Design a protein around this ligand. Structure first.
Ligand code: ZN
Length: 186
């Protein structure tokens, strides 16, 4: 019920990303939600991010977590130590596209950044919502979803925004419109 609204807010974040010929403009919002029969009024925003918000070749999930790490004065790879881990609440990430499980560079993929948050006595991110079951990379596929399931992280596709999410994501690409039509065909 609130999921489409959160993904529209994610799409507005994605539009802050600079269009480039090889990037995927994505936005992400991390939410703390009461477990069970929750009220969206009681949601708390924990962090936000978008592709290339931070210098270099950064993804939306990466920027979302690194923003929180910077505010809490820890290195980005130790953000798991400071993310909320409260009784009766769960961390939920909304992101326009499926988190990637493979990156064409040496950078850690987004699903691994998500899985990393569950360490020690910290619950980490418990569920991912996204609007297109394709990663924010050229690879395509569902490897991100498979890695989430293998790690015990829930995920759910929210239908109805696929074309708009893709049009924004690949706005900087030479063959963007033909590429959108192919992704919607998939
Ligand atoms: Zn990614």
């Amino acid at each position: 019920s609130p999921h489409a609204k959160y993904l529209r807010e994610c799409l507005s974040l994605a539009e802050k990303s600079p269009p480039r010929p090889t990037n995927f403009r994505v936005g992400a919002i991390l939410v703390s939600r009461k477990e069970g029969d929750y009220k969206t009024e009681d949601d708390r925003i924990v962090s936000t991010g978008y592709t290339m918000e931070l210098a270099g070749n950064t993804h939306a999930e990466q920027c979302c977590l690194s923003n929180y790490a910077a505010v809490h004065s820890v290195p980005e790879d130790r953000v798991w130590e400071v993310l909320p881990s409260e009784p009766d609440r769960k961390l939920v990430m909304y992101v326009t596209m499926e988190p990637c499980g493979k990156r064409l560079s040496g950078n850690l993929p987004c699903v691994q950044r998500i899985i990393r948050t569950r360490q020690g006595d910290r619950k980490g991110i418990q569920k991912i919502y996204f609007g297109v079951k394709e990663p924010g990379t050229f690879v395509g596929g569902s490897e991100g979803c498979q890695m989430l399931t293998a790690a015990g992280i829930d995920w759910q596709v929210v239908n109805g925004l696929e074309r708009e999410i893709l049009e924004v994501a690949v706005a900087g690409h030479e063959n963007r419109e033909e590429e959108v039509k192919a992704a919607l065909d998939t």
